[PDB]
Structure formats: structure tokens, C-alpha cells
Design a binder for these strands. Structure first.
Ligand SMILES: [Mg+2]
Ligand SMILES: [Mg+2]
Ligand SMILES: [Mg+2]
Ligand SMILES: [Mg+2]
Ligand SMILES: [Mg+2]
Ligand SMILES: [Mg+2]
Ligand SMILES: [Mg+2]
Ligand SMILES: [Mg+2]
Ligand SMILES: [Mg+2]
Ligand SMILES: [Mg+2]
Ligand SMILES: [Mg+2]
Ligand SMILES: [Mg+2]
Ligand SMILES: [Mg+2]
Ligand SMILES: [Mg+2]
Ligand SMILES: [Mg+2]
Ligand SMILES: [Mg+2]
Ligand SMILES: [Mg+2]
Ligand SMILES: [Mg+2]
Ligand SMILES: [Mg+2]
Ligand SMILES: [Mg+2]
Ligand SMILES: [Mg+2]
Ligand SMILES: [Mg+2]
Ligand SMILES: [Mg+2]
Ligand SMILES: [Mg+2]
Ligand SMILES: [Mg+2]
Ligand SMILES: [Mg+2]
Lengths: 224, 157, 211
RNA sequence: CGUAAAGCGCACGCAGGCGGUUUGUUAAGUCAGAUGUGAAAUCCCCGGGCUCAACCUGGGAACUGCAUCUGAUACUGGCAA
RNA sequence: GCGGCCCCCUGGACGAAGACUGACGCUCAGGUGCGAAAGCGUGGGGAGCAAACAGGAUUAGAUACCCUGGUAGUCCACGCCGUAAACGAUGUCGACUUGGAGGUUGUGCCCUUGAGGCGUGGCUUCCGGAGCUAACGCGUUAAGUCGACCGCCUGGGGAGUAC
């Protein structure tokens, strides 16, 4: 990615001065009109290093969990994660997805049971209303766990949009040693993130820029 | 293969409209006998279930300690709440000299020769935490040489 | 509160009747009385044979008794002798000729009656009620019960005030009519009175029903 | 030493305790070395004799001290700027 | 502790730019002084208020409680006393350590200045991170990180009592 490329998308904007985390001082270029301007000189090289590490992880059969639940970017995260044979969470992150992986496994088992049943049969052994009720349950479970339904085990890395928005997932990852790459705006706390990418986290264009770079590097690592 | 030791069992109670509800808590410590030790604390209505929850919790949340032939690298102080613990390396033959709460943790950890003493509150639950923290911050000559940018003998010799 | 008998509510849905014959009003009561006498005699005579279920059918002018037991060899004896004597006395009790068949229950730990009998026998033979009931659930879940619940009740261990205690693992939906819940009961006559033991075993649901 | 016992009601201020930074000098404190002395027994170490041990006993270490002399001058002190 | 306005005398604090002296500093046992209110001595003054008191409804009793008067006192001048939940229940001084929103009081620069935008000090209130604490909480005005000196503390009751 290019410095011009990020500046065009507007990565450099941040939140207001009154809403900021002091720990992000090194990555803040300054302020104009009472709004913080991030340092893209910090953004570009760190993003390249994150791409390199993600390339190694993906090249060793690594499982990558794309996480972002902002209503603005959820669809983009879903499509970008599916484009590269990886896993995503596009709705509200359930507290304990990683630390309560046992219960999430119970939910995945429920999903597999329901679809296997709905295709083998036994809905002809159930009232048409029971059939519809079980279908509705299956649909809800599919929405809840579609992106991780086939993850199988603990993920090997987390990519996060709006570290503050997804701090719970960052907390579970920190507890479980999973490396976190996170788009961290001026208002967020970068301590829990192994690889912090300092830049705008709201603009859909910038989100798509980050995600496209990540997906390209992941596919490079996958092709071998 | 890991060795597990139950340090203390205690009965707690909660009061509700109908009366007192009795429960139990279990404090256990698991270790590999070679420098890796974890502690667990579980709650349940019955003692065996409480102990089993404690064991499961204790297997995780475990840390590594850089032992030196069954003894510590250097004297160490640990502090948690009101439990101030002091440990020091000892010569061979001394064995485990410590109070019960520290004794179990050090035995399952593998420290064969150590002199220990607990000051202040001897509450087992906090004594175990302070011992674990003290043993965790204890560094080794190779790590301190790595930090200081020199070699081992450059510190030792 | 007070709950309906699981087998009673489920009869005709997912459970079969123990007695299966037709009779007009002129002989229905007589058949019931003969059935009661035959079942009583067989249960007492085979108390130590792990008999799980006595199905009495009345074909024409004859009576076929099928004994579901977990120990067929004891009931049969060397070359059928014991079956023969049981048949010869059941024929006496019934009046009409009698035939006896033996059905083995492959996994007794999933049979409610047999589980209750084991627990009752242990309690009479002086064992800890908690240990006994916990051991039967563990064995039931091991053998694969989708769910199991045991309830012991009344002067446990010789306590002056009777108390009720029950364990339950898995799922035992008693309001689901299509569920297969094998339920039975036993009483332990001990030196301090009667201790009642109820056992529910849930072993899956039945959709097609098949009555 | 906020609430468990424990900050004087508050301020000034004598005796006392401590004191910014540079240079010189002093050797008071400090450090090093040496000498004398620190009774013998007791404790400790290596041995020896009562058939073993207690016990007796040889040599040594120790007795962290005190005083004197010759050195070191970083730090504290004195004096001078 | 201080509350109409005015005058006379007086103390302290803060800021801007400089000039000057050159360690002259901090703390403090005993000591000295100030120290709300109630109180005591002398003499004034005495509107309102009001301990004590008196009366008015008042049961083996009026003590209560409520009303009607109401003295001491409250005020002044001078002495004494020297105690309070005299509390921020946080001894004095110095140094270092992420922020935010306010208040109050100086002062610099700049927009075209008034309004307005950029700083830079003092005091002060509320949130809050690290850290600390038994927790509660404290959090650049610390209860964090250290340094100097002082004042206390050592189970509760007896008792701040006896001599
Ligand atoms: Mg816990
Ligand atoms: Mg104590
Ligand atoms: Mg009913
Ligand atoms: Mg107190
Ligand atoms: Mg004070
Ligand atoms: Mg001096
Ligand atoms: Mg000096
Ligand atoms: Mg000298
Ligand atoms: Mg001597
Ligand atoms: Mg000898
Ligand atoms: Mg000798
Ligand atoms: Mg000097
Ligand atoms: Mg004084
Ligand atoms: Mg007065
Ligand atoms: Mg007077
Ligand atoms: Mg009046
Ligand atoms: Mg009055
Ligand atoms: Mg007067
Ligand atoms: Mg008093
Ligand atoms: Mg006082
Ligand atoms: Mg006051
Ligand atoms: Mg106040
Ligand atoms: Mg006080
Ligand atoms: Mg002073
Ligand atoms: Mg705060
Ligand atoms: Mg007194």
C-alpha cells in the first residue's frame, strides 16, 4: 500500500481531542480544528510488517479470524473474509467465543445436527409447524455462527476492526496468547494488541483498503 | 503425569429467604515437578465436585519457573494483600522448609531445597498467590545477561 | 406437586400394554384376577432371577406368559426343567393351559425396574443411599441412557425424620408425550421401615410412534 | 498513623537532626595494611584416649572489640575561595 | 474564622520584565503566641431571642410535651479560660509520574479588532489510568515513586479514670 493510497482514502483522520487515549501519543501527528490527525508515516510500515507476519501465518496453514462488528463494515468484513478461505464474525461478538469454546462447540454441534436432520429427513415425522420452528432455529444459528461454523479449533490469529469496539475479543485473545492485529484509532487503547495498525477505523473506504491488503497477502500465503 | 495437591478445603454459606445455603470451595495446586506450577480455586455444592473444578482450573493458568537444580536462583520477596512471603535458595539436604500453604506449592513445583517463611496474614488463598508471584518474578542469570547485553560469566565471573 | 404416572400417560403412544388380550364383560374381571395371581406367583418365585417384565397374553383358551429377565440361564435351568415347572404351576393358577417364553434384557442397567431392584437390594443389604444411587446413574449414563433420575425417600440411613433425595443426569422431559421414559419403582423393607425408590430412564424420543 | 489503636487545633522559633553546585586543602569520620592486646576454660574445625558415647585432650579458627603507626582521598565533616 | 456602604492604619498572596545578594535553606523537643462556642471576674448596655425559672390544660406523681412571661447569657471594654466530629477524621517541606471537563484570578501573541483563536502562570471542584489499599477508595492539590525532620500507636473494658 502507498502513503498516497492511504491519504486518499482518509486513513489519517481520527476522533476528537476530548475523546482520546493518551497511550496513542507516538502515533498522533498532531491536531487541526480540534480533531486528531494520525501519523501515516507510522501507519504504512507497520501495515507492511503486519502483512508479512500474516503471510507467514497463512503459509503455515494458519487459521485467521476476521473480526469486526461495526454496522458500517460488517458486510465488507464478511465478503473479504470469505474471499480468502478464512473465518469471520459479522454480528455482535458473543462474550466467551474463545474462552468458552466448549460451549461454542456445543452450538456448532447443534448447527450440524439441525442441517443434517433437515436434509436426511424426519421433518415428515414432525408437524409442519414443528418443521418450520426447527427451520427458524437453524436459520438463527446459521446467522450467529456461519463464519466460524467450520473453524474446528482455536484460531491462530485475530484481525480486529476498532479495537475498542471489539475489546472483548482482544481480551480473550490476550488471555489465550492469540496474536491480535488491530486497526486502532486515536481514541482506543493499543496495549492489548500485538500488532497495532494506527489509522482511521470508521470510513468504509479505509476499512476496505486494509481488508483488501490483508486478503491479498493471505491469498499469497495460501497459494504456496 | 503432573502431580496435584489439595491445599485447603473450606465451607462457605449464603443466606436466602428459606435459610442458609451451604457450599464448598477448594484450593489446589498442580505442577510438573520441573519448574511449572499452576493453582486453582473451585466452588461447588459438594466437595468432590469442588475439587474437580479446582483441578481443571489449576491445569490452566499455570506458569514456568526457572529453577536451579531444585533450588531458587536468588532470595525473593512476594506480596499479595496482607501475605508477605520470603524465600531463599538453600544448600542440598535442607529439604522443603515452609509453612503448609507454601510447602505444597513448592513441593509440587519441584523446589527441593528452599528456606521460606510467611509474614503477616497466613491466609492460604493469598499466601499461595504471593508465593506464585514471587516465584514468577524470579529471573535467571541467562535472562539477566540477555537483558543487560552481556554474557553469563560477565555477570557471574 | 403430584405427577401423572409416566407409563400411564404414555400408554398407547410410545408404550405397550403389559397385558394384551380381548375379553367380554363376562370374563374380563376373571382374566384380570388370574393375571394378578400369576404375576404375583411368578414375581415371588423369580425374585432372585432379575425378572424385568411379565407380559401376559391369553390366546384362545390358553395363556402365554413372557418373562423379560436379565438372567435367562437361572430361569431356564438345565435343559428347560425350571421353565417346565413354572409353566406347570402357571397352568394350575390360570386354569387354562399355559406356555412360558423368556426374553433377555440385554443391558439391565437401562431397565428401570432392574435398577430400582438393585438399589432396593443394596439399601436392604446396608449400603449408603447416596453411594448406591450415584453408582446406578453413573452406570446408566455409561451404558448410554439419554437421561436418568433416581429418587430415594424415607428414613434414609435410619434417620428419625424421613427425607427425600434425588439425582438426575442428562435430560428427562416428563411433559413430552413422545419421549420414551421407562419408569418403575421399588420398596426396600429395612429395619427402620419402608424406603421408596423411583427410577426414570429417558432413552430417546419416538416420532412415528408405532404405539 | 483517611475510616481498624495511632498526625499535636494552628503558626513562629531556640537547642538538636539534615542540607544546592565547583575548586583547593585537611585527614576527623570512612577504607586498607601492619603491631600490640583481646587470660585460661566454653562454642566451632581437624585429630587423639577411655571397648562406643557422654567425658578428657592436641593444634587451629574465632574472640566481630580497643589502642597505636604508615598509607588511600571517592563520600560525609572542618577550613578557604 | 471573615458578609450593608465609606474612611484611617495594617498583613498576606499572585503575575510580567529585569537588576541585585549569594546556600542566607528545611524541620523542631522544651518555649512563645493565636485559638469557635459555652463559662468565670470587673463595669457598662440590654431590641429580639432564650438555659434556669414561673404560670396556663395536669391521673396511684408531677417530671414530660404544648402555650403565656421570662433571669443568666447572647452585645461592648478589659482580664481569664484553652477545650470541640478545632474533620480533608489525611503533620511540615522538596523532587518525579499518562489525561479530561469545569471555576476563579493574572498575563503574551494573533485574526480586522470588539466578540474570537492560539499559549503561558497561581489557587480551586468533579471524573478517571497506571500505581497503591483489607476493601472502600486515592489518583500530578496522591493515600503513587522517594528524600529530611517532627508528633504520636501496641487487644477491649477499667479510663483520659486514681495519685
Ligand atoms: Mg478466578
Ligand atoms: Mg495478624
Ligand atoms: Mg393431578
Ligand atoms: Mg481510629
Ligand atoms: Mg491537622
Ligand atoms: Mg552540617
Ligand atoms: Mg556539597
Ligand atoms: Mg583516622
Ligand atoms: Mg579465650
Ligand atoms: Mg576414639
Ligand atoms: Mg581438644
Ligand atoms: Mg570536602
Ligand atoms: Mg510543643
Ligand atoms: Mg463568648
Ligand atoms: Mg461577662
Ligand atoms: Mg421572647
Ligand atoms: Mg418557651
Ligand atoms: Mg449582664
Ligand atoms: Mg474532656
Ligand atoms: Mg483534643
Ligand atoms: Mg470547623
Ligand atoms: Mg469542611
Ligand atoms: Mg485529631
Ligand atoms: Mg514550622
Ligand atoms: Mg478519582
Ligand atoms: Mg482529668
Amino acid at each position: 500500500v502507498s502513503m498516497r493510497d492511504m491519504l486518499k482514502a482518509g486513513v489519517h483522520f481520527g476522533h476528537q481531542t476530548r475523546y482520546w487515549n493518551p497511550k496513542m501519543k507516538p502515533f498522533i501527528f498532531g491536531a487541526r480544528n480540534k480533531v486528531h490527525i494520525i501519523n501515516l508515516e507510522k501507519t504504512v510500515p507497520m501495515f507492511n510488517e503486519a502483512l508479512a507476519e500474516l503471510n507467514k501465518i497463512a503459509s503455515r496453514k494458519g487459521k485467521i479470524l476476521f473480526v469486526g462488528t461495526k454496522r458500517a463494515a460488517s458486510e465488507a468484513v464478511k465478503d473479504a473474509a470469505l474471499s480468502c478461505d478464512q473465518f469471520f464474525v459479522n454480528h455482535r461478538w458473543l462474550g466467551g467465543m474463545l474462552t468458552n469454546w466448549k460451549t461454542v462447540r456445543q452450538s456448532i454441534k447443534r448447527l450440524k445436527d439441525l442441517e443434517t436432520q433437515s436434509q436426511d429427513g424426519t421433518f415428515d415425522k414432525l408437524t409442519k409447524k414443528e418443521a418450520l420452528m426447527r427451520t427458524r432455529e437453524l436459520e438463527k444459528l446459521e446467522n450467529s455462527l456461519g463464519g466460524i461454523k467450520d473453524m474446528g479449533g482455536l484460531p491462530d490469529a485475530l484481525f480486529v476492526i476498532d479495537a475498542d469496539h471489539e475489546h472483548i475479543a482482544i481480551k480473550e485473545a490476550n488471555n489465550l496468547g492469540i496474536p491480535v492485529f488491530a486497526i486502532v484509532d486515536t481514541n482506543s487503547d493499543p496495549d492489548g494488541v500485538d500488532f497495532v495498525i494506527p489509522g482511521n477505523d470508521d470510513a468504509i473506504r479505509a476499512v476496505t483498503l486494509y481488508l483488501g491488503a490483508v486478503a491479498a497477502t493471505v491469498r499469497e500465503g495460501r497459494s504456496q | 503425569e503432573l502431580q496435584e495437591k489439595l491445599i485447603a478445603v473450606n465451607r462457605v454459606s449464603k443466606t436466602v429467604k428459606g435459610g442458609r445455603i451451604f457450599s464448598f470451595t477448594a484450593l489446589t495446586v498442580v505442577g510438573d515437578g520441573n519448574g511449572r506450577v499452576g493453582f486453582g480455586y473451585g466452588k461447588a455444592r459438594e466437595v468432590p465436585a469442588a475439587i474437580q473444578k479446582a483441578m481443571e482450573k489449576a491445569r490452566r493458568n499455570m506458569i514456568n519457573v526457572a529453577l536451579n537444580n531444585g533450588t531458587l536462583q536468588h532470595p525473593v520477596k512476594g506480596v499479595h494483600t496482607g501475605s508477605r512471603v520470603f524465600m531463599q535458595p538453600a544448600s542440598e539436604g535442607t529439604g522443603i522448609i515452609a509453612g503448609g500453604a507454601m510447602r505444597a506449592v513448592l513441593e509440587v513445583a519441584g523446589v527441593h531445597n528452599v528456606l521460606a517463611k510467611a509474614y503477616g496474614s497466613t491466609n492460604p488463598i493469598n499466601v499461595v498467590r504471593a508465593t506464585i508471584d514471587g516465584l514468577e518474578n524470579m529471573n535467571s542469570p541467562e535472562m539477566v545477561a540477555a537483558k543487560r547485553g552481556k554474557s553469563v560469566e560477565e555477570i557471574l565471573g | 406437586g403430584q405427577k401423572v404416572h409416566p407409563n400411564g400417560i404414555r400408554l398407547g403412544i410410545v408404550k405397550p400394554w403389559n397385558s394384551t388380550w380381548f375379553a367380554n364383560t363376562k370374563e374380563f374381571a376373571d382374566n384380570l384376577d388370574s393375571d394378578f395371581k400369576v404375576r404375583q406367583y411368578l414375581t415371588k418365585e423369580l425374585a432372585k432371577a432379575s425378572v424385568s417384565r411379565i407380559v401376559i397374553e391369553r390366546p384362545a383358551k390358553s395363556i402365554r406368559v413372557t418373562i423379560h429377565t436379565a438372567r435367562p440361564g437361572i430361569v431356564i435351568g438345565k435343559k428347560g426343567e425350571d421353565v417346565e415347572k413354572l409353566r406347570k404351576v402357571v397352568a394350575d393358577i390360570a386354569g387354562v393351559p399355559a406356555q412360558i417364553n423368556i426374553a433377555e434384557v440385554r443391558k439391565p442397567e437401562l431397565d428401570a425396574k432392574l435398577v430400582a431392584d438393585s438399589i432396593t437390594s443394596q439399601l436392604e443389604r446396608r449400603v449408603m443411599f447416596r453411594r448406591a444411587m450415584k453408582r446406578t446413574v453413573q452406570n446408566a449414563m455409561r451404558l448410554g441412557a439419554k437421561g436418568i433420575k433416581v429418587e430415594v425417600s424415607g428414613r434414609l440411613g435410619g434417620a428419625e425424620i424421613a427425607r427425600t433425595e434425588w439425582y438426575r443426569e442428562g435430560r428427562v422431559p416428563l411433559h413430552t408425550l413422545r419421549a420414551d421414559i421407562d419408569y418403575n419403582t421399588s420398596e426396600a423393607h429395612t429395619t427402620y421401615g419402608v424406603i421408596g425408590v423411583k427410577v426414570w430412564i429417558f432413552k430417546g424420543e419416538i416420532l412415528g410412534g408405532m404405539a
